[PDB]
Structures are given as C-alpha cells and as structure tokens.
C-alpha cells in the first residue's frame, strides 16, 4: 500500500490580476497584445503567479529553486529532508537542458545523497514523477518517496523572448509586425508554481492520508500530431522539427524556444484524446462507476473546456455533476504539471475530506495528447 | 514478483567512423582544424563511433525519436510485438525538442496502440532511470511487461554549425585566438550517437538467456557537488548554473549556450569518488556484497583515461574486480552516453559468453552532476 501523507504547494510572490499581468510579462514591439483580452475572457483565470520581481523584473526563483521550496513544505516533525529515500522531480520549463531538473533540485535542497530521477514532458510530467514515486513504495524498493514538479513559464513567456522575431519582422517589412497567435496565446494561459507530495507505505496517524489505488496513463501520440511544443517548429505535414535542425539565426528570427500551441488542433481533439478515449478504457478495465466518485479533480487549463470535458464524461456514460468537481484554477492560474499538486494541497488542507471518500484526478496533457488518472481513497 | 530482461537491442546509425574521418563529419569551426582533437582522442581511446549524419550530404539521418524507435523495433520477435507493450519509458539527453517529452515523440514514431508513455531526463544516467521505472512497473505488478529505451544524437549539437555565431561574434570583436573554449571543443571528440532498448517481463523466456534484475540502486551527490556537464546554460564563477532563459537572445548565439560543455578539471578531480566509490560503498554495506561473487563488471565509463582510475577506486573500498571480468565495447561503439549500458548489455547478452547463475554488476556513472547508478543481474 501507498499513501499520500503530505502535499505542499509553493506559489511565487503575490497573485497578479488581469489588469497587471501584461506589465509583468512585457510588450512585444512596444505594443499591447491584441489577443490578451479575449484569451482571458475565455480561460476565466483571474489570478496567477510569476517568479518575476514586480519592481525589478528579475527572476525570483529558478525552476529548481521553485521545486525546492515546494519540497521543503513537506517538512514537519514526521519527516525531514534527509529521510527521503527517493526524489522524482519534473519541470516542463527546466532551467537547462543538461543536467536533469531533479539533480538541480537536489543541489538546491542539499539533503543527504539519495536517489534522484527526473521525468519530462508537460502537464502530465508531474504525474509520471508521482507514479515513479508510487511504484517505488508500492514495490517495496523504498518505504517513502517524494515527487515534485515546478513550472516557471514566465522565463519564456516574457516579451524579451520575442525581441529578435519582432526585429526580423520589422526588417522584412511585414505589414503586421505582431507575433502570430500561435506564439502569443500561451502568454496569457500559463503561469508559475510548484508542488510536491510525500508518499509512504503507512498512513499518517494524525489527519488525512490519501491511499493511491492506482495511476493509469495513456498516450495517443501514435495517432495525434504534436499540439503544444517548444524548442522546435511544427511543419505543414504536422511533424515537429527540432531546434538543432534549424539555423542559429532562425532560432531568434522565429522564436523557436518559445512555447507554442496549435490552437485549432487542440480545440478539435483535446477532450476526446485526453479524456474520453483513455477514461473509457480505464472505466471498462477497472469496472468503474461514476456514482462511486465523491471528488473529481480535473486539472483543465481553461474555463472554456470545463463543460466540454463534462460533455466528454457524458458521452462515455461517466457523468459527474459540477458539485463534485474541485478546482482552484481561476485563482491559482494554470501552472501546467503543478496544477494537480496545487489542487490536492488545497483540498487536503480544507477539512472537506472525510474517510472512505473516493477521489478521481484527471490530468490532461495537450502537448501530444496524454491523459493521466489517479484514484485516491481517504483513510 | 521477479523482473527479467528478456530482450535487448541496440541501434547504431550509419557506418563506423574512424579518428581520421570524424572531423570532416562534424565540420570545422571558423574554417580551421581543432587543436585539441588529437590529444583528446589519445586520452579517451575511442577508435570508432557513429553519427546520425549522412557522410555525403551531411543531412541528419535520424532524429533522436527515430533512433529510439529503431532500437525499440529491434525488440520485436515471435514472443513480443509492439502492441504487446504495457509501458514505454524513454529518455534522451539530446531530445529533438524541449516540449513534448522525448517519449511521446518516440511513441509517435512507433505508432503502436495507445499505451503508457513516460519520459525521463538527465544525461548518461537517464537510460537507467528509464530502466528502473520499467523495472518497478513490472516488479510491483502494475504491468506484466515494460520497455525502457534511450537514444543519443549529440552530433546535432556537436557539429561546427553550433559554434558559428560565436565565431562571427568574436571576429567582429577582433579576438586574439578565434577559437572556442576547450570546455566546448572537448565533448565534440568524446560523444557520439546510438540507441538501445530493453524488454522487461515478469517471467524468463522459455529458450535462451534472460537476465533477472536483482536491484537497481541510484545515488545523486548533487547536494555537495557542482554541475559538471551542462547545456542550455553557463556555469558561473561561483559554480552555479545560469539557465539559457536568463540570458539574452544575443548571448545564446555569441556564447553557444545550447552547446554541450564540460568542466573537465572538476570532472577529473571528483568523478571517481562521487560516481563510483561513495555510492558503491553504501551499496556494498547495505546489501552485503562480495566482489568475488561478481562474474561480470559492466562499467560505462566513457573514456579509457578513467578505466584504471575507477579500478583504483574499487580497490580503495575493498571491492576489487580484476580486469578479466570487465566487459566494455566503448572503444569500437563510441561513447553514446545514456545508451552505452544498453549497447554493452546488447553485445554481452548475444555473445554466448553468459552462463546460468553468473552475476553481472552494471555501473553507469553520470558526471553531469555526479550520479552513480548500479544494476545487479543474475543469468537464468
């Protein structure tokens, strides 16, 4: 048996409202974004956090430091950093390509030598790190394990990441020097935050523990094109061209290292290939009834998809009405892989959980259409 | 449960490339030969390596995801088809992109039915954290099989074109020596391309050899060691790493921030103690290991220069293993980083040298920020 006994979330700095966010993220070419308003109206996020100083604009935490702050929030008198037998870390916005994110987090925390692994990907990478931790305790390899994930997209969403593209567009005499919607879209969607979870083979004597019944993960990249991508460009045939295959001048002229989204492909395919296709396999294979779910924790990215995911549940006869949904997206921001940790941290600390209640966590990843699902039982 | 490696495959792109050809393939920075190549090659002892590069045109012949997909297809036979795999764990230190993770891109190449895909990251050890993920999936009963795989195409970032804007930047500045730092040029003659994959199952194959994984133990010493191998960043004077996104777009090109760098003197001073002896002495105590019980020692040590240094390390902790029991093919396959242990395991498993009940100890050092990964196998 494996139990989540402690979850912690770390949000950098003060929440930032819709009227302030563009001043923190900067203007491209001296001009406010023409798409910010409608993207915000549709995603419904009201506050988010950035690892950026409101005064100076300096970075306030690297991704490694953000994760380290989350992990240190797991420390109470039942657990110190040196008791950790395994650390599984992930970040879609790692500070560097090599080394892996996890050993940089270990460098920040400075706890004694232990197993450190890094998972990678996007929104689901925090769940693949949590499953590694889960399997480690489940199998008996360790008696505890920590999974942590951090996101600092502010590093790559700031206007300075489009400085050379704007210059190249001005020099090519473009009628419109603005960057494409595919590049501007995520600047109003993604934000910063970090989370961590402590997993152990016994529940905690005090308070609530969450037994992990299973974590099921399905990738549909065999049939779906890349949808969210960075460090590369999506070609006309739907394939992805990696940054190292493009010239150095093109990295800057086309902002190859910014985060992009094929928004039309996302809208058309995200519900089916992150929710209904995986969940209907899981529902069939585990004989699940949506009546048995007390809490549904869906880490969707945008209020736009909330009822579209709900329609998805309906289509596979796994309806769950809104009163059993729990999300803090609109006041925490879409923090990518950390979203589920930030949702679990609030629910565990709310007192609303009661023994024997069952939780279904849904973590979609639009990057190339993964759905991750975790089933939990309050003990 | 038990977990068994029942199949291993390796995929080396193109033809072996010798020391005299390798610079014509990776190109010349600023039109002139590398001054350190000759002595780098003498120290590392590598005689052939592979590049996912076309010898005539210089075009890429495989992405990182394609190379891993080729390794994975080498696992397929009468007992296993791609659609049988219940979990795929993939890593690459040279992923083609930053998002999505490398594993879903390998899945897009293989096109097998929807399944669990996970990606690990890091450098030379990441193939082993993918293998341990796969191992724990089967060990815990979550699956009956799992595939781990890893691929490396550093030729993508080792080619001279990756230093061109830095050369231009310094010519515009009137530089005394228009040469890239040794910490950038070093790896261009160390690292090469290759991929491996392993199939793990909860039962041995009926015929032929299987390797039971007794354990995989991993230790990171990043709590006290500095970053030593890095890309997408710059090491500062205080030993910390500055990420690429904290530097200006102009500096990315002027300083070749996305190329792979190594702090060689920090490597030399610390690699033996903080990838081999510190982790291995803990493991020997906690598991009560006898060096005599080890029939095969598989060290993926990346350079002949370190071969006897690691051996002395073993002596210092009373875990001597004589040279006759050391198996490596680094010298003719190249240093393929995270793939090296797969490429050694592939050859040894198919060689016909293994006998039932023999014990294999695998050592995968990662100098990136000093991780040591160890796998114990029993032939069955």
mmCIF file of C-alpha atoms in Angstrom, chain A residues 66 99 127 147 149 252 270 287 329 378:
data_model
loop_
_atom_site.group_PDB
_atom_site.id
_atom_site.type_symbol
_atom_site.label_atom_id
_atom_site.label_comp_id
_atom_site.label_asym_id
_atom_site.label_seq_id
_atom_site.Cartn_x
_atom_site.Cartn_y
_atom_site.Cartn_z
ATOM 1 C CA UNK A 66 10.729 26.767 -7.001
ATOM 2 C CA UNK A 99 21.653 18.208 -16.245
ATOM 3 C CA UNK A 127 2.002 12.643 -12.631
ATOM 4 C CA UNK A 147 7.532 13.627 -6.162
ATOM 5 C CA UNK A 149 7.119 19.428 -10.081
ATOM 6 C CA UNK A 252 15.976 34.037 -32.958
ATOM 7 C CA UNK A 270 -8.243 17.551 -26.549
ATOM 8 C CA UNK A 287 -15.298 -1.673 -13.717
ATOM 9 C CA UNK A 329 -7.625 27.116 -11.465
ATOM 10 C CA UNK A 378 -9.315 8.983 2.113
#
